[PDB]
């Protein structure tokens with residue numbers, strides 16, 4: 001049965017899809033994401049699918065044109081968090097630890113700027129905890145090497161301006177504050193705006209066509225079609241879109257007893273928005289009948305590592321059983337592990353068995369301008385398509401699903 | 413053609429549905445709403461429909477067990493706004509007008525309680541505007557006669573405790589503050605909680621069955637199946653559920669060229685939550701093909717007035733044209749007007765022509781324990797079902813839709 005998939009997975013199709021998509025970054029809600037949506041829809045229609053396009057609005061952020069941070073009179077290197085409010089505040093700097101509700105209750109922040117150490121709780125909550133105490137701005141300092149870029153997750157008027165700074169620069173400020181120094185800081189953020197944008201999911205469904213053998217089961221194969229600002233997104237996640245399209249073309253050649261939904265999600269990089277909107281469209285019957293959701297994200301880089309399957313809870317489920325079974329016949333041992341950070345989290349949240357397929361450890365080009373077509377491996381793309389497609393077809397081929405026992409290891 | 417609908421609308425069916433549903437209030441997310449969902453689903457299945465149940469979560473509120481308001485030492489009559497945070501604050505009372513961002517920028521609120529006059533902006537925004545300035549609680553006073561009950565709309569940690577008081581009691585406090593008095597108040601709200609609840613929409617679809625005459629058009633007929641706390645909800649909105657079910661039974665007897673979706677929405681009284689969740693499930697193709705959405709809310713009270721159609725923008729649209737055309741053949745002149753406040757607002761927001769059918773002015777029993785079966789008129793229910801069903805069938809019967817010109821008046 002695996003031969004029905006492996007003789008048909010065309011790695012030139014997949015590379016051509018990445019080449020098309022990665023001519024420019026596809027930031028969610030932008031004209032280039034809309035172009036991708038149209039392209040994706042056309043490809044599915046070309047394989048014979050009826051396609052639906054689900055729109056959704058979300059709050060986008062335009063990054064501030066000025067980010068001025070000063071300690072006294074010395075200017076410092078500052079990165080505005082995404083969704084940071086504007087500010088122009090000069091005031092006393094107060095160290096409040098990790099910024100928990102505990103950490104901030106005891107201190108006087110009204111009118112002041114909070115210095116807060118990265119860790120434990122969300123950037124969002126650190127900002128809100130300080131702002132609830134009257135902080136006019138928040139400086140968050142790193143837990144680890146290099147710059148602190150990040151996000152408050154979404155628009156929120158409980159926030160006050162929030163800027164991230166190096167562990168080196170913050171550790172030193174925190175030391176001086178602990179030592180009894182009174183420090184004054186300036187936090188000026190200007191030109192940031194929140195604006196409503198519209199993104200989309202592209203959904204192509206193959207109804208079962210096996211007559212008396214047809215089951216009520218559904219399998220979702222997903223990827224996301226947006227990329228981060230300035231990243232061409234060839235691997236993150238044109239690769240997964242390309243495997244999603246290619247497997248829909250392959251399955252169009254075959255009888256199936258299981259409904260397959262091939263989906264590309266919008267606004268993944270914004271916090272899984274499009275898969276949360278698609279999961280919220282499902283009825284209770286659809287949720288109970290969905291036997292697995294396969295998420296393909298970063299599945300073509302020559303510079304990443306071996307394939308792994310990640311689940312939200314680090315437990316095995318039907319999708320990791322099918323991925324391990326297909327790999328054992330095609331490639332070898334396929335490990336699993338625990339990780340979120342992609343659209344499988346939206347389906348796990350409904351109780352649906354779900355896993356992310358990704359090459360790990362990831363390449364250095366992730367979320368950079370160097371995430372480009374010249375890092376793509378056709379052989380990797382083909383191997384992921386053979387494994388994921390054979391895992392899906394193990395259930396979707398006509399006849400009762402059987403999974404034979406197979407050990408496979410958890411890897412961290 | 414109208415005779416295919418008017419000979420079949422069974423007012424005993426509709427009254428029996430209200431009698432079943434209104435044995436107790438159906439608060440969204442509660443066991444009684446779940447019972448209604450099951451009942452509704454069963455009835456549609458009994459007419460031959462395939463039914464889907466769309467779940468959705470939302471944040472529910474448990475009302476505080478203590479609401480203590482004092483001006484100095486005198487205790488006052490206070491109503492917590494829905495979604496009010498808890499508090500226990502004794503502090504200076506400061507009049508801040510209507511509570512706009514203007515009204516509050518100039519004053520010193522930090523640690524204090526804001527007195528704010530109802531009007532112009534949402535209760536929610538008045539609370540957030542004051543809280544952004546450091547207010548520890550907000551007292552909002554009425555614009556008009558009687559008690560001030562209301563809602564901050566949804567859960568929100570930007571809020572601080574908010575309680576509503578009479579125009580009489582507030583006008584007097586505002587007068588004294590304007591006159592230079594320094595006033596101290598206490599606002600104590602205790603035992604309020606926000607908890608995640610799950611509600612549902614029930615969706616029954618009749619696919620077109622007219623062969624070569626089939627169109628691509630869709631019509632939605634909606635109502636909501638929840639009611640407010642302590643109200644049995646016979647008219648608000650078991651009445652509309654009963655017309656929705658009855659028209660689905662009627663249309664099951666007839667050939668149609670237009671897809672009909674009969675929907676009962678959950679969590680309407682919480683801010684249209686279920687229809688917003690259902691509208692968000694539609695694809696762009698479904699939205700473009702939906703030629704009208706008919707919302708039935710409060711359509712059976714002996715103690716309300718004549719039928720009217722309300723649109724969000726107070727403009728005529730295809731649904732008010734079809735309602736006016738059917739009425740002109742069945743009953744007489746059917747006026748339209750401008751009003752929101754029901755699930756048609758969720759479809760208008762997508763560009764879909766939508767109108768609410770309701771008897772106006774509404775009865776005195778609205779949102780009370782007296783919204784009960786003994787106020788229901790079978791004749792009214794039958795007339796709404798004849799008019800709405802004939803309006804829908806004017807498009808859904810086989811053959812090209814034709815609407816003949818008809819004047820009908822705007823009424824305020």
Ligand SMILES: CC(C)C[C@H](NC(=O)[C@@H](O)[C@H](N)Cc1ccccc1)C(=O)O
Pocket residue numbers: 236237268269270271272297298339340341342358362
């Ligand atoms: C919640 C998401 C928006 C989180 C965001 N996700 C992404 O960037 C996804 O495109 C990444 N493909 C997720 C990822 C990266 C590296 C290893 C495993 C998983 C991330 O920061 O990783």
Ligand SMILES: CC(C)C[C@H](NC(=O)[C@@H](O)[C@H](N)Cc1ccccc1)C(=O)O
Pocket residue numbers: 648649680681682683684709710751752753754770774
């Ligand atoms: C946004 C909604 C939750 C608003 C809420 N809506 C409701 O109570 C609906 O059940 C009412 N049926 C709406 C209504 C009442 C009177 C006249 C016209 C329309 C309301 O307060 O009217």
Ligand SMILES: [Zn+2]
Pocket residue numbers: 006009382383386
């Ligand atoms: Zn291969």
Ligand SMILES: [Zn+2]
Pocket residue numbers: 006007008009010011382
């Ligand atoms: Zn191949």
Ligand SMILES: [Zn+2]
Pocket residue numbers: 055198200696
């Ligand atoms: Zn669009």
Ligand SMILES: [Zn+2]
Pocket residue numbers: 224236237268297298342
């Ligand atoms: Zn990705």
Ligand SMILES: [Zn+2]
Pocket residue numbers: 228236269367
């Ligand atoms: Zn990414």
Ligand SMILES: [Zn+2]
Pocket residue numbers: 379
């Ligand atoms: Zn090789």
Ligand SMILES: [Zn+2]
Pocket residue numbers: 418421794795798
């Ligand atoms: Zn009649």
Ligand SMILES: [Zn+2]
Pocket residue numbers: 418419420421422423794
């Ligand atoms: Zn009748």
Ligand SMILES: [Zn+2]
Pocket residue numbers: 284467610612
């Ligand atoms: Zn449920």
Ligand SMILES: [Zn+2]
Pocket residue numbers: 636648649680709710754
């Ligand atoms: Zn209602």
Ligand SMILES: [Zn+2]
Pocket residue numbers: 640648681779
């Ligand atoms: Zn109501």
Ligand SMILES: [Zn+2]
Pocket residue numbers: 791
């Ligand atoms: Zn009569």
